[PDB]
Amino acid sequence: KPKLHYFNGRGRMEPIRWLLAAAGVEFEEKFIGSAEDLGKLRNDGSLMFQQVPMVEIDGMKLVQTRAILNYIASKYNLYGKDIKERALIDMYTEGMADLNEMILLLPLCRPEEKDAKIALIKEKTKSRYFPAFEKVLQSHGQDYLVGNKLSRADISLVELLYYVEELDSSLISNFPLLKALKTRISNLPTVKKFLQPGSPRKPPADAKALEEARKIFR
Amino acid sequence: KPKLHYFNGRGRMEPIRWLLAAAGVEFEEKFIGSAEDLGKLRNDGSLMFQQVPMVEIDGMKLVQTRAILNYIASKYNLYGKDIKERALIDMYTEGMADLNEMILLLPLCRPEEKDAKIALIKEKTKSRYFPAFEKVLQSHGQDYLVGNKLSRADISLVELLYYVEELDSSLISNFPLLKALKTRISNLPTVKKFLQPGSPRKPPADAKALEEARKIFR
Ligand SMILES: N[C@@H](CCC(=O)N[C@@H](CS)C(=O)NCC(=O)O)C(=O)O
Numbered sequence: 001k002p003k004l005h006y007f008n009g010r011g012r013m014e015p016i017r018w019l020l021a022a023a024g025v026e027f028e029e030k031f032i033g034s035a036e037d038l039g040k041l042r043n044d045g046s047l048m049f050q051q052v053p054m055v056e057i058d059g060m061k062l063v064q065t066r067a068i069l070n071y072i073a074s075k076y077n078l079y080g081k082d083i084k085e086r087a088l089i090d091m092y093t094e095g096m097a098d099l100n101e102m103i104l105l106l107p108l109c110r111p112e113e114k115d116a117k118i119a120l121i122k123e124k125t126k127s128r129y130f131p132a133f134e135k136v137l138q139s140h141g142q143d144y145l146v147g148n149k150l151s152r153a154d155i156s157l158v159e160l161l162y163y164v165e166e167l168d169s170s171l172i173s174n175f176p177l178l179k180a181l182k183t184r185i186s187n188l189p190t191v192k193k194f195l196q197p198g199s200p201r202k203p204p205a206d207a208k209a210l211e212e213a214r215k216i217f218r
Numbered sequence: 219k220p221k222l223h224y225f226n227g228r229g230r231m232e233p234i235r236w237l238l239a240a241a242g243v244e245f246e247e248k249f250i251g252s253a254e255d256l257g258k259l260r261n262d263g264s265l266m267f268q269q270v271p272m273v274e275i276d277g278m279k280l281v282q283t284r285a286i287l288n289y290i291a292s293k294y295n296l297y298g299k300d301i302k303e304r305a306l307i308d309m310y311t312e313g314m315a316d317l318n319e320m321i322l323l324l325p326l327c328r329p330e331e332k333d334a335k336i337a338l339i340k341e342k343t344k345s346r347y348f349p350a351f352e353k354v355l356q357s358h359g360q361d362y363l364v365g366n367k368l369s370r371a372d373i374s375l376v377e378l379l380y381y382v383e384e385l386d387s388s389l390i391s392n393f394p395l396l397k398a399l400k401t402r403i404s405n406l407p408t409v410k411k412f413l414q415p416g417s418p419r420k421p422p423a424d425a426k427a428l429e430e431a432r433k434i435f436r
């Protein structure tokens with residue numbers, strides 16, 4: 001069983017949880033709850049760059065989010081059928097990571113900044129990102145983004161759609177195809193289970209959570 | 219011939235120029251010199267996320283640095299022999315990307331915070347990154363980072379070694395294996411040509427350069 005090392009929260013590890021659950025893979029989590037917990041990991045020489053996420057899988061101690069995701073996607077055949085499909089998949093997911101990065105960092109923005117940031121995110125979501133993905137779905141009219149079959153791109157997108165919903169649920173409003181994809185994916189047996197209460201799925205970070213995580217990683 | 223769309227500067231396109239030259243692939247560049255040049259790319263629908271880097275290759279208009287790099291690495295056999303070798307490669311390159319991002323963003327730091335940033339980069343270079351890569355070279359005693367064969371990780375690392383040298387040439391002093399890799403990789407025919415004057419290799423951005431790019435993208 002793959003074991004995920006991270007604090008008890010979303011952070012950068014969430015995408016990995018989504019992908020494994022989607023692939024139908026059982027996994028364990030070992031939560032870091034103190035600077036000393038991180039310290040131990042860091043001293044065992046388990047973290048190549050002395051950072052987490054870190055995942056123990058197939059005899060490896062993989063570090064670096066993209067590295068972990070690529071390995072998992074390939075192993076479970078959610079990374080396309082050829083080099084060109086991987087290109088489309090990577091192009092789509094990097095765009096998703098860019099939008100997710102703005103949202104993921106919103107808390108660190110100073111109170112005078114935040115307002116300006118929020119407007120920006122919303123603006124880019126409606127004029128930049130959602131239009132781009134609605135357009136690929138439109139380009140071929142299939143239920144999946146690439147190769148007419150489930151891939152990590154579909155899973156990342158839907159994960160991103162839920163996050164956006166938490167910000168402002170009206171942003172997806174003028175994008176039917178994205179709405180249809182969200183429903184379809186949320187209904188796949190594996191994802192539906194992951195979406196239910198009590199799953200390893202993590203909640204949005206709250207004041208307390210943010211703070212406590214800042215102590216650990218200092 | 220692949221065509222790279224970016225401004226005449228290092229920016230985020232440089233790693234891609236490095237990889238292609240190393241693989242011995244001739245390419246063309248179409249420099250963006252104004253907001254109008256960029257505007258024409260957006261209006262052509264050539265930029266999926268209305269951003270560059272963008273590379274025209276094998277019939278596609280690839281965007282997103284990481285997407286482009288992964289495609290090129292596979293095409294020219296610089297991406298390992300299997301899923302696990304790709305995991306090591308991805309892990310090593312992502313760490314490299316993190317250090318690079320810090321150096322890349324240095325010119326954006328306000329004068330009052332620059333010194334602290336510079337200090338952080340130097341410290342992390344010596345206690346975090348260089349030790350990690352030296353350790354892997356030490357682990358197997360081979361000329362290359364992975365599979366005892368040239369790969370994108372070796373090419374990326376050396377480019378990074380040159381950037382570090384521009385900042386502080388004493389930073390690599392306690393890492394002989396990295397020093398040897400730098401010489402070894404720099405002597406490969408394709409890279410030696412790329413390092414020679416008059417090549418597509420780009421210079422450090424001077425005050426003016428930053429200023430102009432700042433205008434183009436806003
Ligand atoms: N680029 C890395 C970022 C990893 C990272 O910043 N991890 C933070 C927690 S979010 C950490 O471990 N910080 C402690 C440190 O930087 O020493 C990845 O995608 O996995």
Ligand SMILES: N[C@@H](CCC(=O)N[C@@H](CS)C(=O)NCC(=O)O)C(=O)O
Pocket residue numbers: 094098229230268269270271281282283284435
């Ligand atoms: N994550 C993208 C970042 C691309 C990016 O920020 N491109 C800048 C030039 S450095 C741009 O085109 N900015 C114009 C804009 O954001 O509208 C990638 O690695 O390719």
